[PDB]
Design an enzyme around this catalytic site. Structure first.
Site, mmCIF file in Angstrom:
data_model
loop_
_atom_site.group_PDB
_atom_site.id
_atom_site.type_symbol
_atom_site.label_atom_id
_atom_site.label_comp_id
_atom_site.label_asym_id
_atom_site.label_seq_id
_atom_site.Cartn_x
_atom_site.Cartn_y
_atom_site.Cartn_z
ATOM 1 N N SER A 31 0.840 -1.189 0.000
ATOM 2 C CA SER A 31 0.000 0.000 0.000
ATOM 3 C C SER A 31 0.878 1.242 0.000
ATOM 4 O O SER A 31 1.800 1.356 0.814
ATOM 5 C CB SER A 31 -0.937 0.013 1.213
ATOM 6 O OG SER A 31 -1.874 -1.052 1.158
ATOM 7 N N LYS A 81 -1.638 -0.790 -9.531
ATOM 8 C CA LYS A 81 -1.680 0.283 -8.550
ATOM 9 C C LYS A 81 -2.882 1.173 -8.841
ATOM 10 O O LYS A 81 -3.058 1.629 -9.975
ATOM 11 C CB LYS A 81 -0.378 1.089 -8.585
ATOM 12 C CG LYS A 81 -0.513 2.552 -8.205
ATOM 13 C CD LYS A 81 0.753 3.311 -8.573
ATOM 14 C CE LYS A 81 0.690 4.756 -8.112
ATOM 15 N NZ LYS A 81 1.968 5.482 -8.364
ATOM 16 N N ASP A 97 14.970 12.034 -4.807
ATOM 17 C CA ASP A 97 14.297 11.395 -3.672
ATOM 18 C C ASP A 97 14.240 9.898 -3.916
ATOM 19 O O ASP A 97 13.188 9.258 -3.793
ATOM 20 C CB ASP A 97 12.902 11.976 -3.425
ATOM 21 C CG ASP A 97 12.337 11.592 -2.024
ATOM 22 O OD1 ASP A 97 13.037 10.896 -1.261
ATOM 23 O OD2 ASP A 97 11.200 11.982 -1.682
#
Ligand SMILES: CC(C)(C)n1cc(-c2ccnc(NCCCNS(=O)(=O)c3ccc(O)cc3)c2)c(-c2cccc(O)c2)n1
Length: 333
Positions: free
Chosen positions: A28, A49, A145
């Site tokens: 999740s 997804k 990131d």
């Protein structure tokens, strides 16, 4: 005779095309929940997804729109590609959820970090990390990131990146994972390509150390962690810092910082063979070059691809209604 069918996996309900079968939740994520599935048309297992209301939040809308366009325009062996994207809704006003289907990966990168790894498999995973990043930088996009959870790995050792990185208020319980952000990001400094090498550094260092190198509840906490081990930055790095940011850094107590052989002891690396003694020498050396607070001292992705450890494997703002229409057109060209 609806081509879609609804099943409930976890708390939320999943509406998917008939082709996808035996849905089970692999994980999740904030953007959406992910389920493992089998494709009758493909004869291969896939991961689906679900993005729910990507238009409701401008931050969600910008990420959703960027993800859809990038997965289509960019294709690379180390960058996850979408096999199919569908929405069960039939009109722009009805549309609410977007479903992205891609290739199913066996494990998460975090899981690989936990196991004790051989140099060849480690150098191969890192090599793939640089290849994808190199492709991303070629496309003009700097991830900024990179995180282990966003890196998926296969049983055969193939590695793929899940997201395209940062481009900002969100209102949820989920918490971002900032351990792998560079100092130029932590200090809001202006970045460059080799801002992602720092993330590769935090990951390579966590595989060896088996702990998060710079874990902190806040950027300040994390900056304290980075300076303790690495050492307080040099003055030239300070001059690069904006005055308000530079003041904070210089007020931080000064740390001499551990030495890289001391940071990553020889014991963490295998010493069974001469080749492994040399590999550890080559590994600790690459770590020292990637985990550099100043980006000008940091190594470039290409030079890291040339590094002996890595080289052996080488052969916008819109209204929410506007955002919904933008995302909808991406779902249906
Ligand atoms: C953020 C977003 C929505 C783009 N996203 C996309 C993915 C994604 C894509 C393709 N393949 C995967 N599967 C391998 C890792 C799954 N984890 S598992 O528990 O080891 C597991 C593996 C096989 C299995 O049959 C049962 C459990 C995940 C994830 C995701 C999900 C769970 C953990 C995670 O780190 C990341 N998130």
């Amino acid at each position: 005779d609806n081509q879609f069918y609804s099943v409930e996996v976890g708390d939320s309900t999943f509406t998917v095309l008939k082709r996808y079968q035996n849905l089970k939740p692999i994980g999740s994520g904030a953007q959406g929940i992910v389920c493992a599935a089998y494709d009758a048309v493909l004869d291969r297992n896939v991961a689906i997804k679900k993005l729910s209301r990507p238009f409701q939040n401008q931050t969600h809308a910008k990420r959703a729109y960027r993800e859809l366009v990038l997965m289509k325009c960019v294709n690379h062996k180390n960058i996850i590609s979408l096999l199919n994207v569908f929405t069960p809704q039939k009109t722009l006003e009805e549309f609410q959820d977007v479903y992205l289907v891609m290739e199913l990966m066996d494990a998460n990168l975090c899981q690989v970090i936990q196991m004790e790894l051989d140099h060849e498999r480690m150098s191969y995973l890192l090599y793939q990390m640089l290849c994808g990043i190199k492709h991303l930088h070629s496309a003009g996009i700097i991830h900024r990131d990179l995180k282990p959870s966003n890196i998926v790995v296969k049983s055969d050792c193939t590695l793929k990146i899940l997201d395209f990185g940062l481009a900002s208020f969100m209102m949820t319980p989920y918490v971002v994972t900032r351990y792998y952000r560079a100092p130029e990001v932590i200090l809001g400094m202006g970045y460059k390509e080799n801002v992602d090498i720092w993330s590769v550094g935090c990951i390579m260092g966590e595989m060896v150390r088996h702990k998060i190198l710079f874990p902190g509840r806040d950027y300040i906490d994390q900056w304290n962690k980075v300076i303790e081990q690495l050492g307080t930055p040099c003055p030239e790095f300070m001059k690069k810092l904006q005055p308000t940011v530079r003041n904070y850094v210089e007020n931080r107590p000064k740390y001499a910082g551990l030495t890289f052989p001391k940071l990553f002891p020889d014991s963490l690396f295998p010493a069974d063979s001469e080749h492994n003694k040399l590999k550890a020498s080559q590994a600790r050396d690459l770590l020292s070059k990637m985990l550099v607070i100043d980006p000008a001292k940091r190594i470039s992705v290409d030079d890291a691809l040339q590094h002996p450890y890595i080289n052996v494997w080488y052969d916008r703002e819109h209204t929410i209604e506007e955002w919904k229409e933008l995302i909808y057109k991406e779902v249906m060209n």
